Amino acid sequence: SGFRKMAFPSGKVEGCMVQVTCGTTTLNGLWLDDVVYCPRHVICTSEDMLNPNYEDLLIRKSNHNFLVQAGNVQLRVIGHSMQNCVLKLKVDTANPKTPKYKFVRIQPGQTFSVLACYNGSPSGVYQCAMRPNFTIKGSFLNGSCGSVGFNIDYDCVSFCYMHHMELPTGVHAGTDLEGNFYGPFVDRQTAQAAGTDTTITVNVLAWLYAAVINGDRWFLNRFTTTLNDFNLVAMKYNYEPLTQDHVDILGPLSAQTGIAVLDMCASLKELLQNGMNGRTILGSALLEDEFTPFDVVRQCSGVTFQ
Amino acid sequence: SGFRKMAFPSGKVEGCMVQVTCGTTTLNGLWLDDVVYCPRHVICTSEDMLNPNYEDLLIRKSNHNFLVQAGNVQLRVIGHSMQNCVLKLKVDTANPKTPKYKFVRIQPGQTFSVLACYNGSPSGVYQCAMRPNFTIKGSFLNGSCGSVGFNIDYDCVSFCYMHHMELPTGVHAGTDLEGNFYGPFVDRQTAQAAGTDTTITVNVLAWLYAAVINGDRWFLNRFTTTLNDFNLVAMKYNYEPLTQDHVDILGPLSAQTGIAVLDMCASLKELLQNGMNGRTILGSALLEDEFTPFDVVRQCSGVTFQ
Ligand SMILES: *[C@@H](O)c1cccc2[nH]ccc12
Ligand SMILES: *[C@@H](O)c1cccc2[nH]ccc12
């Protein structure tokens, strides 16, 4: 028992992190096979950081302008190209630590692990969710550009996020590993901002089920509600609508706890309308929305990876 | 910016995890050089699990009774011995992935990373603190015995915890890597229970400083307090006393924020006496006590490891 924000073991990703330097900009790159992936903003100078034409900036570069270091061993760049907002550097050495991997793009509401890095050296690992507004509430300092987010399934690493920048509210924006931004953000200097967010309803319900599995029951009740009536309440409190597919996805947790999904919706309705009245759920005084139904099932049931 | 529960990168520990089977009990072991460390309870059967004499149980064992598997490769046990509550199995192969390491014992109030494992395969990583009552609020299912907790300093892994058992409130107890239990717990079947806990005051103050660094200031005030007057309030709310050494340890964070330590104590006094009145600090509606001053400085300033 217990319930923690749990990241995937990071070893398979640690062996891919390298340092990329170009001019006076140093950031992180991801070394898979004989390609290093990094944010294209590495080719930018401070004056360039206003409205850059990256195609012009890149044609002016030579392979030898890119200094790539894997630990204390230098990698020879032998080609370079741009894909959307990422750069692809061919090096003369395939990474012998390349795991089996995929490049996947995730949905708002999904979670992933982040390996924060600086100067190509991993610093820490933590769990994040992609917000409905396509930002993530990360923990990043300068030099963390190019740190990646990922999930692991058996032995295969699905990379889903590369970090690019911090927005004015302190939240973070980046791309998938094809270089396409999550949300309406750009890698140039603008007044861009997060814009309005919502709470991930199906994840809150999953977490209430985690709580019942772990012995917190004070918020349960005899009442039930209809899906339409719950969704009218979700809308008032800025929760996102609950669909029949969400209900279906919650079936296994409902069957394990014996609590009908619509019954747990009635409990959530009461919690939004009454607050918590000084009590806690799984050590939190707030309704937590950064655990998916899958996250709850891995942690309360117990699957590993190799 | 941002502030997350952040674990150390787990790769160096993943390469040490193995599976140990004896009879019908399977759990995790830690393989360093040519020794595998695991809980001595592995030699116990269900009837033995009432008041076992482990010295008798162990003399009845042969090396060949211990099946040790590193991935899908079997390790030959060539010796065995008991140290306090851990078992030490000599194998015929030194682990080529052995990091530089130390066995350290930590203090209540300190934090560490936990690599949860099952069948010798790492499952997830998360951050924990050692509670004042010598338990930890972990996330563990059956088969997680022998999972370890650790910190990393530059390239050196300081192992501080091996997991043994779950107590009736759902919290967890284990040993240091010398096999000495944290707190008044034993590896036999009793009615043992956690017993009363307190809140780690210096860690709460560190986290308030993290919040100010990250832009949360609503809880600040002009007031100050004396150390004795704060400690009278800490005692009412079951917080642990604040010492002059705690004040000294908070000096760097105080100097960075310009907020005197005793001023931040006056803020904490107000928060205990008034609650939070519907607001949050670093995304929490509770006063968080599982970040040390060191944790705040690594994350709000930014050190890595190799
Ligand atoms: C580094 O990830 C990056 C990418 C885009 C824009 C930007 N500005 C400062 C760093 C940075
Ligand atoms: C496995 O860590 C362990 C250690 C002591 C007592 C005990 N009971 C069930 C598992 C276990």
Curated annotation (Swiss-Prot), chains A, B:
Changing C145A: Complete loss of 3C-like proteinase nsp5 cleavage. The active site is at H41, C145. It is found in: Host cytoplasm; Host Golgi apparatus; Host nucleus. There is a cross-link at K5, K90 (Glycyl lysine isopeptide (Lys-Gly) (interchain with G-Cter in ubiquitin)). Coiled coil: none annotated. It catalyses: TSAVLQ-|-SGFRK-NH2 and SGVTFQ-|-GKFKK the two peptides corresponding to the two self-cleavage sites of the SARS 3C-like proteinase are the two most reactive peptide substrates. The enzyme exhibits a strong preference for substrates containing Gln at P1 position and Leu at P2 position. 3CL-PRO exists as monomer and homodimer. Only the homodimer shows catalytic activity. Interacts with host FBXO22; this interaction promotes the proteasomal degradation of nsp5. This is 3C-like proteinase nsp5.
